[PDB]
Amino acid sequence: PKHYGKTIKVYEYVPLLDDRNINDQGIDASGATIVNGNLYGSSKDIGNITSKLPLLTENGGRVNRVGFTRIAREGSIHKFGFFYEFTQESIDFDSDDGLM
């Protein structure tokens, strides 16, 4: 659109388990806060998955909290142009017409 500057931006929503999902909402199954909000990132290791599973118990509250993140993109536009010049004698006295 006109009158809005020279940029376009969007939102990209990362999944819950992606590595780019960095936040401070984590609470592990024991009930204590942890650094990583996402349970496990793109790690495909069996050890990590076994360690960081969400396990619920018989009487459970405030055990597993998760968070989310969004990122932004952008792009802009530019201008181009060029020209050329000629004189009247060149057009009139040229052997071949239709040069222009």
């Binding site: 495909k44 290791d45 076994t50 599973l53 969400p54 998760v66 989310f68």
Partner: protein, 200 residues
Amino acid sequence: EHLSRELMNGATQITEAVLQKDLLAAAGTVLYAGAATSDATITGEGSTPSVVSYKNLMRLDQILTENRTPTQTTIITGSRMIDTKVIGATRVMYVGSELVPELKAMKDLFGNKAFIETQHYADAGTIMNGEVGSIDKFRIIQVPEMLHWAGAGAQATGANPGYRTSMVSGQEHYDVYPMLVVGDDSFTSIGFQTDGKSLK
């Protein structure tokens, strides 16, 4: 709406991962490639690297036929189109995306190509979801999210010929990859208040 959708996607991914780890941990017939006899001994350095080979697939086939496990699929006879080859694979094996080049480069008993692409036998045959080819008696299916043990391998020195490694307790160690085969009627899911579905 975005928050709810991401929540549900995470739930589905977690459930599938749990199922996969349960299946992997309880494998009955386990075979170690190369000369290794334990999980730690597997290594990529030396006279005998522990990479999959044609004779290992033949061994797995022979062991499975000895247990009288039913086959999953039937052989494919030829079709009249030119440059079409027959295949005699009767089982389905699931492999990760990491091992596919290793499978493609593999040699048979006579030194020719063992791998046969889905393009040759697409006619007169049904190509399953995720099928990339077939080797010997197995048809190979590539699952995007196959898990693996990282650092379970033997200690990695500087003679590394190009295999993947991970850092364990300040030392680099090799990785180990599943290459799983699942037989008919091996396992069942328990459904509690599920109304006939595996998960609610």
